């Protein structure tokens, strides 16, 4: 067996610092039917071992021979098609799975930050909100900061399809009403393909 392809994490393809990767996961491989082989194809080419690396199993009573391929930020962003071609004895035929990034003119996201509600100013903690809309495709990375340092207690809703075929989401940072009172400045970081330098940063404070 049972194959599943996975696309790279958005943040990985937007910064050369990190290495993107197409992860091919195969589940429920039998004890008597191991020996799992792989084959990666990028736009047809490469039938013979490319720059792959797969290993590790053991499960509920089955296997799972997960292969991993290093992606070129450009390659992926330009839309090259990645094809994982698994091959197993206990498998009727050679299964397959392909994938490329969502097609379509990319659209730069709008980032707006919102203060906590007056009504929420009655709790020992407040909600810093970050709105992000108008972006396409949906791959996106959102983070928070305070004067150079990272914020941990935040949650981000997944991408949702708006009326115009674009996506939007909201990120929510939970902070002590005091820190918001002291006038500290928080910032919403958004990583996306259509942003200049694949990155924009918006601030909020009392």
């Amino acid at each position: 067996p049972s194959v599943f392809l996975f696309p790279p994490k958005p943040k990985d393809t937007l910064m050369i610092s990190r290495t993107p990767e197409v992860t091919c996961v195969v589940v429920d491989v039998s004890h008597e039917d191991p020996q799992v082989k792989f084959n990666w194809y990028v736009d047809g080419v490469q039938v013979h071992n490319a720059k792959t690396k797969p290993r590790e199993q053991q499960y509920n009573s089955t296997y799972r021979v997960v292969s991993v391929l290093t992606v070129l930020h450009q390659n992926w962003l330009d839309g090259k098609e990645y094809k994982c071609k698994v091959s197993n004895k206990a498998l009727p035929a050679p299964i397959e799975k392909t994938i490329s990034k969502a097609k379509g003119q990319p659209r730069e996201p709008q980032v707006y930050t919102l203060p906590p509600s007056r009504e929420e100013m009655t709790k020992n903690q407040v909600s810093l909100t970050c709105l992000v809309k108008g972006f396409y495709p949906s791959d996106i990375a959102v983070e928070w900061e305070s004067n150079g340092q990272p914020e941990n207690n935040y949650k981000t809703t997944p991408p949702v399809l708006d009326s115009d075929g674009s996506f939007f989401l909201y990120s929510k940072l939970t902070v002590d009403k005091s820190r918001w009172q002291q006038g500290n400045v928080f910032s919403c970081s958004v990583m996306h393909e259509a942003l200049h330098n694949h990155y924009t940063q918006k601030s909020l404070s009392l």
């Binding site: 071609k85 498998l91 009727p92 035929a93 050679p94 299964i95 397959e96 379509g104 003119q105 115009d164």
Partner: protein, 211 residues
């Protein structure tokens, strides 16, 4: 600017008045053109600046709109008008097109009649094996064919071809050819073509056993 046409396939009868819509993601004033294209031929300009008919284009074609919403109207479809229509925003240096609208002759839904053909031994003697699947007389044009060899789902070893609407019954037909060497062909027994189409309530499989 992104241009989107509606619908993607427009089905109508001869003599009908039909409208194709084109929307721009942002205002483009009236910088919008419409082209007609027949299969294997060059696009032909029909209308530009939203509503100006190119000299020589028949008067049954008209265009309207401005800003973000545009329409091509064909008032009294003739057999010559069944074709693809493309809208285009054209600017100083670049241009961008809609996805195209195929205008086809409307008929009732028809499921494909499916046939599989083994390779001839005459060919096989030469070292190649072509296995052919025929999807006959179906409508609408969208269909899916997959090949299985000894129940193994195949990938990347087939090609497909589709006819234009049949002149008598307005259906489509499709051929898919699975190509293997003689040697690879003789390695396996069961050859099967599996087909889906909206006109079928379940997939249709045709098969033969080698030899």
């Amino acid at each position: 600017v992104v241009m989107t046409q509606s619908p993607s396939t427009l089905s109508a009868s001869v003599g009908d008045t039909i409208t194709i819509t084109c929307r721009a993601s942002q205002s483009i004033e009236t910088w919008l053109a419409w082209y007609q294209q027949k299969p294997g031929k060059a696009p032909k300009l029909l209308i530009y600046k939203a509503s100006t008919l190119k000299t020589g284009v028949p008067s049954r074609f008209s265009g309207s709109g401005s800003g973000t919403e545009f329409t091509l109207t064909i008032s009294g479809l003739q057999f010559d008008d069944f074709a693809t229509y493309h809208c285009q925003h054209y600017a100083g240096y670049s241009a961008t097109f809609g996805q195209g609208t195929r205008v086809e002759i409307k008929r009732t839904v028809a499921a494909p009649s499916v046939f599989i053909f083994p390779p001839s031994d005459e060919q096989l003697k030469s070292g190649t094996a072509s296995v052919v699947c025929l999807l006959n007389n179906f409508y609408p044009r969208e269909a899916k064919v997959q090949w299985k060899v000894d129940n193994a789902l195949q990938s990347g070893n087939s090609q497909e071809s589709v006819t234009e609407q049949d002149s008598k019954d307005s259906t489509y037909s499709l051929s898919s050819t699975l190509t293997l060497s003689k040697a690879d062909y003789e390695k396996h027994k069961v050859y099967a073509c599996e087909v889906t189409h909206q006109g079928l309530s379940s997939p249709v499989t045709k098969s033969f056993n080698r030899g």
